[PDB]
Swiss-Prot record, chains A, B, C:
The name this protein goes by in its record: Copper-containing nitrite reductase
Family membership: Belongs to the multicopper oxidase family.
Top-rank taxon: Bacteria
GO CC aspect terms: cell outer membrane
Protein's organism: Neisseria gonorrhoeae
Subcellular localization: Cell outer membrane
Principal subcellular localization: membrane
Other observations noted: Undetected during aerobic growth.
Amino acid sequence: ELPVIDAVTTHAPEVPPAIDRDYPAKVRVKMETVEKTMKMDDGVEYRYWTFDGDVPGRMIRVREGDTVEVEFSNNPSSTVPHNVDFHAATGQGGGAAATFTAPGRTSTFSFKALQPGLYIYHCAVAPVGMHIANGMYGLILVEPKEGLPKVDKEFYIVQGDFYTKGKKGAQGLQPFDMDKAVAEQPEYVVFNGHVGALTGDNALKAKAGETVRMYVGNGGPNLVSSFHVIGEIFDKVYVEGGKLINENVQSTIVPAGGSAIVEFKVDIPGNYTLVDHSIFRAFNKGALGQLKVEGAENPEIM
Amino acid sequence: ELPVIDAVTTHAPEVPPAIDRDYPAKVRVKMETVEKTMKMDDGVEYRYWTFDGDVPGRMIRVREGDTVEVEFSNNPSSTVPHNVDFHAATGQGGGAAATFTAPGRTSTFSFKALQPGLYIYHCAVAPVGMHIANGMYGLILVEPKEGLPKVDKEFYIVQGDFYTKGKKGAQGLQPFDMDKAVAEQPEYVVFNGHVGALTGDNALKAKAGETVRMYVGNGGPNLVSSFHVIGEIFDKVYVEGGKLINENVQSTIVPAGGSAIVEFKVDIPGNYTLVDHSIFRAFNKGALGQLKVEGAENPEIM
Amino acid sequence: ELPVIDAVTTHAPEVPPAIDRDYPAKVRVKMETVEKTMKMDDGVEYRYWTFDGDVPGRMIRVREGDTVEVEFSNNPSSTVPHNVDFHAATGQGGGAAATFTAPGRTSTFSFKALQPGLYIYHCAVAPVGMHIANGMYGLILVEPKEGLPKVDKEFYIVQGDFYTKGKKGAQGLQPFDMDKAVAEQPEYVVFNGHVGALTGDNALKAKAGETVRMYVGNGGPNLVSSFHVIGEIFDKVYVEGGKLINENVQSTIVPAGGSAIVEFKVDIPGNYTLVDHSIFRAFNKGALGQLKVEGAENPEIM
Ligand SMILES: [Cu+2]
Ligand SMILES: [Cu+2]
Ligand SMILES: [Cu+2]
Ligand SMILES: [Cu+2]
Ligand SMILES: [Cu+2]
Ligand SMILES: [Cu+2]
């Protein structure tokens, strides 16, 4: 009946420890859905619907072949039901039916992680687009039996497009705007739920010489990302999050509800900024993050 | 001088029989273009321009090296000329020049299927975007000499974006809207020409344990699909319809005027819904289909 | 120390000579940024911001391991600063910081081309989107140590979306429109800076039987291209400009700020038109180019 393991799920930029076991296990994951008002941008508030308090949800890391047992709780203060659809799960709605949880209630269910990959998980309660648009999406990494190559640093990044009634910058609590959502005209396109979530004081950090791996998800609802890191090149790209590996790519497409894994070695100090290369989203809508690399200067490289 | 064979072209969800011959042949295909009003959605009618009566056109299945002889007929009642551009054909407009057919006339021409792959074919009469937008696109599968691996079930799925004058839901006969087409703002995004074409009573059917292959095309005119099947994972993906094969992909990009071949084994009963994961298209514009899988329950999977 | 070779850069359709050396070198490149008014379309003028007088900039061709020394000059008549971010360069802004050049000034800096590939380079002065949108982008091809396979013809093609205040066709000098840029609603989508740049008398030329390679870039700012050549099929596609090679692809995605290398043999005479298969961009917004192939007819093909 498999060894029991309490999963270590991480809040985002952080990734759980690499899997140091070579046998299947039942991994217990606890998830709670809570609705809360937070800052989208300076002076701009939004009513986010979250998985564990923020956007994206906590990253789950398991091994191919594991049984994932989820204890799904919908906070008592929630105003609507919530559930979870794991793209990593095979079967009815990816777990949506089994995890339909009204406020103040807890659901439990398990699924076997049959295939390795970087999968998006999100709420699938009607209206599906609204539950996703309000921030209910995260990533679950299903490692191959053999595991992934060691890397110096790992980051959890999820892009998403938000639809605000007021336009970008309008002060105050901004409601979700269904019409802009349907027309695919977001006001904010950000990494990890807020403008600046991965910038300024919250910038990611690495040291010169380190090999960096970024687990990049795209919660959508609607946009497709042309992911790029200014100042660097992708040594490796797990195309669309699958087994296929591309090399020397400057910018990759991350499908809606899809992902990608990028790896690059940062050999020289400086500030590298992650962006959706559909450029105006980055410099006008918030799809901008920073990777600060400390260390010492090599004039030969630049 | 090559044996002559009358091809079997199927209406959509269905795929023609796998090629059971290991020698080149001249495959005779008969195509007719007919304009007709049909139901886009409940109470919503649209004037479709079709290849053989519906959207998409009939799927053609040939073998690499075959000579495809097309007898192209434009129905007497058509109001405009029609032709066909096969992405599988090498040469002037992919056959567009040779197949320019006025109403009540018949054209004939042949081309050699030089390269294996899943190719889109569509009308290319000016204005090209309008002819495509009204539904004139289908898929031609060109099998490799050695043929494709046996599979239990095969489905013909083609996504397309439609531009209606009224907004989604507006009752009555809705005219094509050029302005929305140019701005890439469709009202309907559907699989196989109509909302629900592959859902409800028209849902695709398979049995638990069967390996399923879906020939997925994207007629456009403008959108790019983040194809995904809720509840399942792609075991194999012929990237962009070519020779390259990816594995364990949750969601793939299907280029405009492009395709993809996805294969997955359905091991547990239930309802799986195909969607464009640019989510609002699926739950708000119609890009939603269903694969009903009967059989017996495996709790170990979920 | 390394040898010093002056680089041979080319204006677009043309590609520099293949690298005929098997040792590292310091390649001197001279670039000048000049702002000038040119014809976007018949009767339509636009104030382009360019790298060396046109869009795209001159193509640079170097070898993996080379040190690229850039003498960057901002023409005295320019009204704003300009710099360059090479996606091929590893380090601070891809050279943006070191190349920030006010009008009438010259900057110099060097970087080591560590990785092979087809890279986009563009201006990164605030506001970044505007500098890119006005035409400041080009390609730098970094050949692998071993070099790329010989081909009969090579073409330099870069797609880009332009945001005009007036709508497509509006006569006169059309100003950049920030609002359309942010909403990702371009008026013109073209290959090589202007409508018709690669068509009519400016059509690309090849002879029947020749193997053709196209270095395709996508300067954006915002669109993603579903690159396709009507009448032909891609024998090889360097996926997203990386090492990975796909085959028998009808249409590939070229990411914003990304690229692709496509190779195909043109075996039969005729006119082949390159397009963004998000069709309305091609036939309504200008994303249309032509490849005129000379030679002699083969009815066995079509
Ligand atoms: Cu929810
Ligand atoms: Cu860039
Ligand atoms: Cu999903
Ligand atoms: Cu037509
Ligand atoms: Cu086409
Ligand atoms: Cu500039």
